[PDB]
Symmetry: C3
Subunit: 113 residues, 3 copies
Amino acid sequence: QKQPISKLTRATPGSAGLDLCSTSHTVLTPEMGPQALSTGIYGPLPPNTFGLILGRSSITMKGLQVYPGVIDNDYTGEIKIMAKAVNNIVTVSQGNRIAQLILLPLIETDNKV
Amino acid sequence: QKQPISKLTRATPGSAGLDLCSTSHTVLTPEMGPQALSTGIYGPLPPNTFGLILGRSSITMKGLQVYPGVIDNDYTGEIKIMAKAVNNIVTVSQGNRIAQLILLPLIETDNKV
Amino acid sequence: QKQPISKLTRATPGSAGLDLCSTSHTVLTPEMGPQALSTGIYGPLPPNTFGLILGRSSITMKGLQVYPGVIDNDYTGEIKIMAKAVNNIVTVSQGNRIAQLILLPLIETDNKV
Ligand SMILES: O=c1ccn([C@H]2C[C@H](O)[C@@H](COP(=O)(O)NP(=O)(O)OP(=O)(O)O)O2)c(=O)[nH]1
Ligand SMILES: O=c1ccn([C@H]2C[C@H](O)[C@@H](COP(=O)(O)NP(=O)(O)OP(=O)(O)O)O2)c(=O)[nH]1
Ligand SMILES: O=c1ccn([C@H]2C[C@H](O)[C@@H](COP(=O)(O)NP(=O)(O)OP(=O)(O)O)O2)c(=O)[nH]1
Ligand SMILES: [Mg+2]
Ligand SMILES: [Mg+2]
Ligand SMILES: [Mg+2]
């Protein structure tokens, strides 16, 4: 079954991000370029917020780049992590925390849709 | 003529980002490194906000990395997209939506200027 | 001695970011992959805020990629800049402004810790 964002956990009370884990074992090589890693977690977001997926610094330092991703407030699909091995072969084990979801205020503007 | 940020459009009502298109046809190769793509859109931003330029996930997944860029509230120059082809040759057609502008609250602090 | 975030400066009144400088001379090559650059600046952040470390566009355009980093509200360690030379050899002189700290509201949620 789909899991909502309310199922995510914070590492600590003062952690800005909600941790995102891949649900698959994935191996990445630099030549593969960007890959979208499955999380089994689904939008949408709390009212008046949007999300940003960012890397965890310990993962970034281990050579896996998470490309910052914008999660729209009303996206109801699966939140995937866009990732690339920078220089070396990187192996993601199932359940490893690979990224984090940050929630931010969605500012209203009069821009046309 | 310069176009202001109010001319940008959202893909959907609940889209966090305002789409940014290049005004030129540009081809990018990995060896070129970061390139600043013209948009013909100009700051400044709404009061008490700043901007962040981020990639669109469909573009990121096609091998074009947009480096997150900070747009200062009172910048009045042209908003450019900083982009790099990750692994392969990437071709941007004129008018293609390459990035998105997210607006965020500008927090005041007492840090010196 | 440790320096707090209140010691950072803005380039201009309307600058979104607080500039971060490396305290060391560092040379980076693409094959080195991500490196954590010392700043001598320490958390924590103002109440109800978290931080984001982002690149300065002039530095990004010179071939040094700063990986976006999340600074937790209650982190009390040293803020380091995660950086990689994209394509060429990059040299950071001591005191050069390499990145910027953006402060953002920390939204409360009921996610478990
Ligand atoms: O660019 C950065 C990013 C993070 N940091 C520090 C501050 C942040 O609060 C701390 C933890 O960052 P992340 O949560 O992104 N890293 P990770 O998930 O790997 O560690 P933790 O589980 O402790 O949160 O690392 C930096 O100094 N520079
Ligand atoms: O890292 C990400 C980024 C986006 N997404 C999903 C959520 C987001 O709302 C949706 C659309 O993202 P973008 O707007 O960044 N992509 P794009 O502009 O390519 O598609 P769209 O036109 O639908 O907005 O893709 C992820 O799952 N992971
Ligand atoms: O992706 C971007 C990032 C920045 N910019 C413009 C807007 C921003 O206000 C201006 C300055 O950006 P940064 O502060 O990130 N660059 P830098 O520190 O190199 O210049 P400055 O000292 O003037 O702030 O560059 C873009 O057009 N696209
Ligand atoms: Mg963390
Ligand atoms: Mg979009
Ligand atoms: Mg600056």
